[PDB]
Design a protein around this nucleic acid. Structure first.
Ligand SMILES: Nc1ncnc2c1ncn2[C@@H]1O[C@H](COP(=O)(O)OP(=O)(O)NP(=O)(O)O)[C@@H](O)[C@H]1O
Ligand SMILES: [Mg+2]
Ligand SMILES: [Zn+2]
Ligand SMILES: [Zn+2]
Lengths: 656, 665, 156
DNA sequence: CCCCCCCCCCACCCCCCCCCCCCCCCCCCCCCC
DNA sequence: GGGGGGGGGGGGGGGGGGGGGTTTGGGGGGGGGG
């Protein structure tokens, strides 16, 4: 009745699977042609609630980026033509080949001659609903699509790998048709199909094409693995567009295929026919700071409020009562200054380093834990949990290549970010000394195992410390309150001194706030999910002048887009401040005022202007920066002299 | 070209979607034009696979799962429609698709044979096609407790209601096709693993003979599931009332069903002749005897501990062996030296019918569940008590005609039917006085004997060894029955002269030839011979004259080669062999013919500690025989030391010395 | 395991596995010539979840506080990943020998290069050694809920 | 008593083997005595 | 009616071809000096 090269089926026939395995059904050619038409119809007709076609817009964007990848949201395919979602789950290797051909057809329709830009398209299966942890995978997941959580533990190089390869038989008429290379084994040619016999074989150098390849060791998240167990891992394999989408020491969420293969090594050492396994990745996602044009306009709108700086500073660590100088210093550090280089000759630190020194139970550690959630790139390390190499950088002899390679420490991972060092006073000094270069010269200069190089380490370090003996003692100056020496202390170019003084009207407001915060955080306290989010929003507004979700994107925007300039700053104001601070810092136990503290005033003034999204630094930014630094110096003093110093420096601060 | 095959498979896939499917508004729902699609699929079978001898459609139809995923749903839902309608009395149309589904089931379950006449494509496709039939058999027996079986009987009942004449040729054919359906569903069985012999064997043989598909276990295919589903669909009731009603167009398929029910089941399994744990303890004690035997044949110390025995022979020469047990037992040393030889004599070797008692391993048994055992034994009981003589008369009165055209399969299945039910009724009547030998009286009616004689005579003349073996079994049961009725008593004397002269000679010639054929062939020869000798003795033309025709050396070779399997034989079989030896050696006293070393070897092996059961009744008979045999061998050697050489050889057919060798003056 | 022949696309199935990864010796198709050239059909073949765990002699039972003795244990199916390191467990199952599968000959692997046993055809000149292992069918140790209903529905 | 040091631990030919080919032996069938 | 000779199958031997066979860094434990 119909041409066998064009026979095609109904959708209910596709639901009525009547081959044995799913793959046997997908590979039936009438079913395959039907599936192609089905997915094409899906891409061209699924829409946003605005009526705008989703994959029309995503394809338009794909071509604009010259990308090889199309992010198909699985939930969309589950909403319409859900049988195809089932086949995609149960049989991804066959389905994705079909869907790739369909996606190339769709974009070739959208852009003529996109075959000239890429000869192929890969669909990326986003938003797959079911998720497994690495401990949770089993035989029943073999060849299934999976979505997995883990941290990338070891990432290899970006090697070429064969994709389509004709082979040469060294007997007879040599060429064999193109085999397709997998992620798992070498091609085998049992016999040459021309002479139908054994022989030697070799890669054909004309008709072979390569794709990018990269294995990654993916391992259980330490905030997930249960107690009393070794963390589990799998070798992820990335191909083509997915290489170097992530870097080690970062969480990822991985959509892929859990595939097994024979390996004589595993059978050999285990003594059973036990197969190796991988996750052939289909898509990789890192796991908030991304923002939209309306969010950009929102940032502009709220920034021109003349009170924005204090609304930000109040928003810093909102459930922490008081401590406004800490929140100021944290705000300054988290926005940072502007890094500079004069004619390429003289590079200057843009980062602002902050030390929180003070008594037990004064929220210093919790402030660091807040910043860990709030910054784009950050890492947190405590005391004897750190080592010098674990902090800056380290080297290891790669078990694959047998060559020595670097591996980044905390201050490499937090490059262009902030690094959080708790219990700074109780690290070993043979670890603390490693901080010096990265903290000021913004670099790490390893020379080890033949490797000799300088890495970039553009970090603001925020550190928390207890004074000598156990708590602060304001009868002493700073140099006797703390074991840290003048060089490292001079690098922390704001100091916060935190004291737990008994004070009835402060303690009652604090205690009331802490109790209110505890009940406001209790677990039991436009559908149901959205309704409790709206109550949550009002609870956040109980204490925060701006949302934290907004603040993080605002920070990331201000950091990455805004570069203030010191246009017409009051030089003599700053110079007299530095001259007087230096003169009063002649006290041999005091905080060592140094040229880097003058730069600190300038960096901080830039950071306040950054909070205003301001191209230019105002007098108000510079006055606030001076006031911050002067207060930091004045409170670093034995109380016998603090009143006199306050009176002397008041001429500079009390103009504002 | 294979382009044709993929086009054909695309066509059958499209037809597979045309039949129907589940309706979510789950029930199965027919497609538009569904009757025409079923007819077109029947037409594909005819148009291509039959007319061109291909089986490609029969493969494609299994690939797209039409039988399991459409046809049995159609039949079972139609069964529920008609069942509910019967209680509460456009069926005129839906009846048609039910019938065409039955036609398609009969086609797709149709038995497969491979011969020199089969196309290369057919014999290539044979294995996987058999596997798909096994999946079909599993699904047919399992699905909704096999409700499609009641669908089949209901389709037959809707032409059994009308008059004997009113059943038109189409109605007669429809009933015949229903019988062929039940026959086929019984008949599907795992295929033989058939290997190319051009290329040599590797350093290991075939890794496994298992030819089941992965979604099937052998228990899914076993008789137990057949009995259960046939009982739960009252197929046994349908067959019983059908055979009672016979008063003949369908008679051959109706016989054939009972053959396929009986071909591989042993009658004794239906009779007993903590119980399971008690018998398991008995079994474990029996094999613990073999454990203590091999332990006696095992070193007390580790394998690297071996010193060296030297056997100095009666001559001044020495052999060497490492056996620590042999070091203190020269018997083990001698036999171990013989085991060590790398050389062996090379041995030379040695289809359109199913496996059966004709070719199974002699210890094989169906392990029934007791419910299925009761259901099966009571079904065949009620059949014997109603359907046996009428059916056997109908089909044997057919087979009086057309013997020249009777296909080989048809011959063997008829003979097996005869033998199986005659043997069963004899056994049941030995167990129950309530059961009567007259209930199989049709077996002894003289036309039956004449036909069975014609079958065996023609088969032997044609050298059709398969049908010859079948007729040999049937003759054994005929003689068995004759002996029972001779005791229970006219017709006995009729058959006891009708079997004279050339029939005596023919029966005497099977155990001459039997040594060249399989163990079951030889076993049936021994069984027939024991029956023949007890029959002739019961009568006792001359008794000495007949038994002389048996007591000749190729018969002794056949008995020996049968007895060579002694561990695998059963106690009663060894008893029959040694009763024959008792006759030849003690009674007929032709002792010279058994003074040959093969018997000496075999006697030692079976009397060995690792030979027979110490407690076996057959061991007692062997011991009794061996004592007398050794005494006479000693006596003859004392009288005639030339026999020390003659023991090695066949006896001298040169009479002038042969008489002296035989008797020694 | 289930395999398809390289020179004809027939399928062998239900291949029982020894301690080596085992492939068919003869092709089922009498029209085909093949011995030992196969591709595994992954989707048709059957796998078991498998996990080796190593145990050592219990601390109180070591006769004088010396080095403990060790044993390899195999878990399969639903028993996998129930045990944990440092846990003290009772197992039940079968004591079994395990050959050196490399010495027995294995695809893609060389034979490994006191005594074993020889003469067996698969070894040729080589001689085979055996480990001892325990094939466990059941394991238990001999050494939180955040809602009332999900806890209380477990109580008698 | 505390901190630093330093010590440990770890990452081309020849043999075995297998495949292919050819011959010889043993059985079966037919004819001759 | 039995034994020899001719013809075909099956197994074993022999040959030929092929593949395999220490330094450097880091953390933690353990011991010694201020
Ligand atoms: N102003 C505050 N507002 C809210 N919670 C506070 C405040 N001060 C202290 N806390 C609580 O004090 C607890 C301990 O805080 P933490 O961050 O450890 O202080 P800390 O100064 O770092 N102490 P330490 O680790 O000994 O240096 C937390 O659970 C806080 O909730
Ligand atoms: Mg703290
Ligand atoms: Zn070639
Ligand atoms: Zn093959």
């Amino acid at each position: 009745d119909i041409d066998p090269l064009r026979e095609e089926l109904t959708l209910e026939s596709l639901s009525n699977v009547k081959a044995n395995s799913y793959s046997e059904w997908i590979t039936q050619p009438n079913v395959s042609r039907t599936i192609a038409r089905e997915l094409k119809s899906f891409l061209l007709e699924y829409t946003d609630e605005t009526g705008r076609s989703v994959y029309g817009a995503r394809i338009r964007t794909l071509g604009e980026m010259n990308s090889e990848s199309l992010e198909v949201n699985y939930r969309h395919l589950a909403e319409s033509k859900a049988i195809l979602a089932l086949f995609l789950a149960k049989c991804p290797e066959e389905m994705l080949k079909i869907f790739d051909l369909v996606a190339m057809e769709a974009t070739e329709l959208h852009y003529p001659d996109y075959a000239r830009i890429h000869s192929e398209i890969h669909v990326r299966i986003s938003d797959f609903p079911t998720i497994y942890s690495l401990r949770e995978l089993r035989e029943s997941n073999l060849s299934s699509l999976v979505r997995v959580t883990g941290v990338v533990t070891r990432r290899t190089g970006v090697f070429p790998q064969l994709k389509y390869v004709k082979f040469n038989c060294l007997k007879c008429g040599s060429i064999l048709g193109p085999f397709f290379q997998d992620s798992n084994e070498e091609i085998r040619i049992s016999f040459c199909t021309n002479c139908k016999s054994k022989g030697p074989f070799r890669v054909n150098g004309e008709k072979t094409v390569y794709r990018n390849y990269q294995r990654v060791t993916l391992q259980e998240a330490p905030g997930t693995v249960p107690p009393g167990r070794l963390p589990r891992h799998r070798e992820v394999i990335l191909l083509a567009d997915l290489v170097d989408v992530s870097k080690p020491g970062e969480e990822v969420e991985v959509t892929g295929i859990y595939k097994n293969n024979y390996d004589g090594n595993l059978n050999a050492k285990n003594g059973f026919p036990v197969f190796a396994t991988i996750i052939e990745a289909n898509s990789i996602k890192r796991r908030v700071f991304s923002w939209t044009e309306e969010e950009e306009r929102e940032f502009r709108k709220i920034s021109r409020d003349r009170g924005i700086i204090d609304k930000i500073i109040s928003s810093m660590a909102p459930s922490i009562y008081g401590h406004r100088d800490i929140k100021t210093a944290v705000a300054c550090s988290l926005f940072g200054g502007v890094p500079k280089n004069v004619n390429g000759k003289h590079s200057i630190r843009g980062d602002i380093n902050v030390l929180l020194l003070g008594d037990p139970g004064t929220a210093k550690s919790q402030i660091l834990k807040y910043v860990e959630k709030t910054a784009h790139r950050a890492v947190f390390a405590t005391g004897q949990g750190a080592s010098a190499v674990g902090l800056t950088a380290s080297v290891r002899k790669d078990p694959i290549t047998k060559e020595w390679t670097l591996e980044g420490g905390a201050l490499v991972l937090a490059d262009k970010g902030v690094c959080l060092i708790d219990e700074f006073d109780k690290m070993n000094d043979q670890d603390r000394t490693s901080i010096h270069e990265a903290m000021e010269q913004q670099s790490i200069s390893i020379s080890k195992a033949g490797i000799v190089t300088t890495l970039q380490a553009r970090c603001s370090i925020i550190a928390a410390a207890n004074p000598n003996g156990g708590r602060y003692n304001s009868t002493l100056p700073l140099a006797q309150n703390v074991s840290l020496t003048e060089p490292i202390l001079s690098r922390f170019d704001i100091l916060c001194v935190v004291r737990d003084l008994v004070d009835e009207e402060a303690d009652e407001r604090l205690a009331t706030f802490v109790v209110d915060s505890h009940v406001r955080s209790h677990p039991e306290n436009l559908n149901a999910r959205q309704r409790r989010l709206q109550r949550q929003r009002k609870k956040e507004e109980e204490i925060s002048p701006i949302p934290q979700e907004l603040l993080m994107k605002y920070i990331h925007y201000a950091r990455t887009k805004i570069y203030p300039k010191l246009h017409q700053m009051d030089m003599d104001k700053v110079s007299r401040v530095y001259a007087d601070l230096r003169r009063e810092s002649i006290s041999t136990g005091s905080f060592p005022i140094t040229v880097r503290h003058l730069e600190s005033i300038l960096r901080i003034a830039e950071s306040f202007a950054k909070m205003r999204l301001s191209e230019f630094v105002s007098s108000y930014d510079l006055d606030r920066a001076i006031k911050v630094v002067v207060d930091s110096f004045v409170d670093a003093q034995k109380v016998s002299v603090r009143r006199q110093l306050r009176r002397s420096f008041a001429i500079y601060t009390l103009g504002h | 070209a294979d382009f044709s095959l993929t086009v054909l498979r695309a066509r059958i896939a499209l037809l597979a979607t045309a039949i129907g499917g589940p309706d979510y508004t789950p029930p199965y729902k027919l497609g538009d034009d569904c009757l025409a699609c079923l007819k077109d699929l029947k037409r594909w079978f005819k148009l291509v696979d039959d007319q061109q001898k291909r089986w490609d459609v029969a493969m494609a139809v299994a690939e797209y799962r039409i039988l399991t995923d459409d046809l049995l749903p159609i039949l079972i839902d139609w069964e529920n429609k008609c069942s509910l309608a019967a209680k509460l009395a456009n069926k005129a149309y839906y009846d048609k698709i039910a019938l065409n589904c039955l036609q398609l089931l009969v086609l797709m379950t149709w038995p497969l044979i491979v011969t020199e006449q089969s196309s290369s494509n057919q014999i290539t496709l044979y294995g996987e096609l058999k596997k798909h039939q096994l999946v079909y058999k599993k699904t047919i027996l399992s699905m909704e407790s096999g409700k499609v079986l009641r669908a089949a009987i209901r389709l037959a009942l809707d032409v059994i209601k009308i008059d004997r004449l009113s059943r038109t040729p189409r109605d007669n054919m429809v009933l015949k096709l229903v019988l062929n359906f039940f026959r086929n569903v019984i008949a599907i069985e795992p295929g033989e693993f058939t290997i190319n012999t051009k290329k040599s064997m590797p350093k290991k043989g075939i890794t496994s003979i298992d030819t089941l598909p992965p979604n099937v276990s052998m228990d899914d295919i076993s008789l137990n599931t057949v009995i259960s589903s046939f009982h739960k669909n009252k197929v046994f009731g349908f067959l019983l009332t059908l055979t009672s009603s016979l008063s003949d167009f369908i008679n051959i398929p109706l016989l054939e069903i009972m053959f396929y029910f009986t071909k591989d089941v042993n009658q004794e399994l239906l009779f007993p002749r903590t119980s399971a744990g008690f018998e398991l303890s008995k079994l474990l004690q029996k094999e613990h005897q073999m454990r203590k035997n091999v332990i006696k044949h095992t070193s007390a110390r580790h394998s690297r501990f071996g010193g060296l025995l030297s056997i100095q022979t009666p001559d001044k020469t020495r052999l060497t062996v490492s056996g620590s047990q042999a070091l203190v037992d020269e018997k083990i040393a001698l036999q171990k030296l013989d085991d060590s030889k790398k050389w062996n004599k090379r041995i030379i070797k040695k289809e359109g019918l199913p496996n059966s008692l004709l070719n199974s391993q002699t210890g094989k048994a169906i392990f029934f569940t007791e419910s299925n055992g009761k259901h099966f034994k009571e079904f065949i009981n009620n059949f014997i008590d109603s359907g046996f003589n009428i059916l056997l008369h109908s089909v044997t009165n057919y087979f009086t005609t057309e013997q020249d055209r009777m296909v080989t399969l048809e011959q063997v299945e008829y003979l097996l039917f005869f033998a199986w039910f005659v043997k069963y009724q004899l056994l049941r009547s030995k167990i129950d006085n309530s059961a009567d030998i007259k209930q199989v009286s049709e077996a002894l009616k003289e036309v039956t004997f004449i036909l069975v004689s014609s079958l065996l005579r023609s088969a032997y003349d044609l050298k059709n060894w398969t049908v010859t073996h079948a007729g040999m079994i049937a003759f054994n049961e005929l003689l068995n029955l004759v002996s029972r009725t001779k005791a229970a008593q006219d017709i006995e004397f009729i058959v006891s002269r009708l079997f004279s002269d050339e029939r005596i000679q023919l029966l005497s010639n099977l155990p001459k030839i039997g040594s060249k054929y399989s163990l079951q062939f030889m076993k049936s020869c021994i069984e027939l011979t024991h029956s023949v000798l007890k029959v002739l003795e019961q009568y006792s033309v001359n008794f000495q004259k007949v038994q002389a025709n048996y007591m000749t050396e190729p018969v002794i070779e056949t008995y020996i080669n049968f007895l060579e399997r002694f561990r695998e034989l059963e106690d009663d079989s060894i008893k029959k062999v040694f009763s024959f030896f008792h006759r030849v050696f003690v009674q007929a006293k032709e002792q010279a013919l058994l003074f040959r070393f093969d018997l000496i070897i075999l006697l030692r092996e079976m009397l060995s500690p690792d030979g027979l059961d110490r407690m076996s009744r057959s061991r007692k008979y062997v011991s009794q025989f061996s004592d007398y045999f050794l005494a006479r061998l000693k006596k003859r050697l004392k009288k005639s030391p030339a026999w020390f050489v003659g023991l090695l050889f066949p006896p001298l057919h040169n009479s002038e010395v042969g008489f002296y060798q035989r008797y020694g003056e | 395991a289930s395999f398809t022949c390289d020179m004809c696309r027939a399928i062998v199935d239900n291949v029982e596995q020894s301690f080596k990864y085992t492939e068919p010796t003869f092709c089922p198709n009498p029209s085909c010539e093949n011995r030992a050239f196969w591709t595994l059909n992954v989707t048709r073949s059957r796998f078991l979840d498998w996990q080796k765990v190593r145990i050592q002699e219990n601390a109180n039972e070591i006769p004088t506080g010396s080095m403990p003795r060790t044993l390899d244990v195999i878990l399969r199916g639903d028993s996998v990943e129930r045990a944990k390191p440092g846990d003290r467990c009772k197992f039940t199952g079968v004591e079994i020998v395990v050959p050196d599968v490399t010495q027995l000959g294995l695809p893609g692997v060389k034979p490994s290069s006191n005594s074993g046993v020889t003469g067996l055809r698969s070894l040729g000149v080589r001689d085979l050694t055996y480990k001892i292992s325990f094939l466990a069918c059941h394991v238990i140790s001999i050494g939180n809920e955040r809602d009332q209903e999900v806890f209380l529905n477990s109580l008698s």
